[PDB]
From a paper:
Actinoporins are classified as α-helical PFT (α-PFT) because the transmembrane pore is predicted to form an α-helical barrel. The lytic activity of actinoporins on biological membranes is enhanced by the lipid sphingomyelin (SM) and by lipid-phase coexistence. Here we reveal structures of [name] corresponding to four different stages of its activation route, namely the water-soluble form, the lipid-bound form, an assembly intermediate and the transmembrane pore.
To examine the lipid-bound conformation, we determined three independent crystal structures of [name] in complex with the water-soluble lipid 1,2-dihexanoyl-sn-glycero-3-phosphocholine ([name]) at resolutions ranging from 1.6 to 2.3 Å. Remarkably, up to four lipid molecules are bound to a single protein chain. The molecules of [name] bound to each molecule of [name] lie on a common plane, resembling the surface of a membrane. Although multiple molecules of [name] bind to [name], the toxin remains monomeric and its overall structure is virtually unchanged with respect to that of the water-soluble form (rmsd=0.37±0.10 Å). These two pockets overlap with those of lipids L2 and L3 seen in the structure of the transmembrane pore, and establish comparable non-covalent interactions with the lipids. In contrast, no evidence of the L1 lipid is found because the protein remains monomeric and, therefore, lacks a second protein chain contributing half of the binding site of L1. [name]–lipid interactions occur mainly at the headgroup region of the lipids. Because the headgroups of SM and [name] are identical, that is, phosphorylcholine (POC), the crystal structures explain the targeting of actinoporins towards synthetic membranes containing these two types of lipids.
Residue numbers in the entry: 3 to 179
Amino acid sequence: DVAGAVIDGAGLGFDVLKTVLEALGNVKRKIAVGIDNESGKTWTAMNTYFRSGTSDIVLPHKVAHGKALLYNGQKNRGPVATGVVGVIAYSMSDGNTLAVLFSVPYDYNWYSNWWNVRVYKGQKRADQRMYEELYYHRSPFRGDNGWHSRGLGYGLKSRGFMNSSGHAILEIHVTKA
Ligand SMILES: CCCCCC(=O)OC[C@H](COP(=O)(O)OCC[N+](C)(C)C)OC(=O)CCCCC
Ligand SMILES: CCCCCC(=O)OC[C@H](COP(=O)(O)OCC[N+](C)(C)C)OC(=O)CCCCC
Ligand SMILES: CCCCCC(=O)OC[C@H](COP(=O)(O)OCC[N+](C)(C)C)OC(=O)CCCCC
Ligand SMILES: CCCCCC(=O)OC[C@H](COP(=O)(O)OCC[N+](C)(C)C)OC(=O)CCCCC
Ligand SMILES: CCCCCC(=O)OC[C@H](COP(=O)(O)OCC[N+](C)(C)C)OC(=O)CCCCC
Ligand SMILES: C[N+](C)(C)CCOP(=O)(O)O
Ligand SMILES: C[N+](C)(C)CCOP(=O)(O)O
């Protein structure tokens, strides 16, 4: 149950993500991400685009149906007042891209936690424009300590949870609609 591994999908829960979050170190802003693939498709990691922050974890490369991936990120390790903000992109085996936004800001006087999950047509690496789409234009969810669900199209739906603090957990399930 470490960042960079896959686990059985039915084992994903808050306690796994707490474990990942604590293993990372006590840095001011950090995130543990788990995504359960119950999509019927095999996922292959492309990349993570960091608008803010970094990770030392390799995205789990192959995520079969029935598996969840574990991942983490953290703020820049230097003295800069920035958070951990980015997009994960996986290529799904029927030809499209699963994109996951996380935003864990440095300053909660001006910003809040957000996430999003969307399917893009074709095979699309995460980048600044994708980040701007998911953050500004494609109706992200609040990291509000509540669950949110939405249809993705493509025969898929998502349900996920993000907490509100700078030590963030993000749990997402992708299932067949
Ligand atoms: C584009 C490089 C120039 C520096 C701006 C930048 O990267 O954002 C830095 C900072 C860090 O943002 P961060 O906490 O990492 O992420 C939350 C903000 N978003 C999600 C928009 C990036 O956010 C700000 O713009 C500070 C200005 C405060 C105006 C109220
Ligand atoms: C385009 C930059 C200025 C307006 C952007 C914006 O939507 O501000 C978000 C602000 C709230 O930003 P938020 O992260 O909730 O709070 C900033 C933190 N405070 C409230 C302490 C300033 O408005 C709302 O209350 C509802 C918006 C939610 C969906 C668009
Ligand atoms: C009513 C369903 C919207 C989501 C499911 C879907 O059919 O997604 C297809 C596509 C997946 O996104 P993408 O691959 O980026 O294609 C839409 C953008 N264009 C038309 C430029 C290629 O999104 C759309 O065409 C409309 C939603 C995008 C507007 C926010
Ligand atoms: C008087 C300039 C105020 C700048 C607004 C700000 O605080 O940051 C918003 C933006 C948020 O970054 P991002 O979410 O990446 O969106 C960048 C591109 N836009 C704004 C078009 C979506 O960061 C910037 O690129 C402005 C940097 C000006 C620094 C002198
Ligand atoms: C006076 C109301 C507008 C400014 C305050 C606000 O709405 O919170 C906006 C924003 C929080 O914006 P953002 O994270 O872009 O919006 C959250 C909603 N989403 C995630 C959908 C974009 O923080 C800022 O950059 C303030 C800059 C002051 C210039 C007057
Ligand atoms: C951009 N960087 C990651 C190389 C340096 C720090 O940038 P930021 O964290 O101040 O945006
Ligand atoms: C508030 N904002 C200017 C940073 C977001 C709007 O930018 P844009 O994505 O419409 O170019």
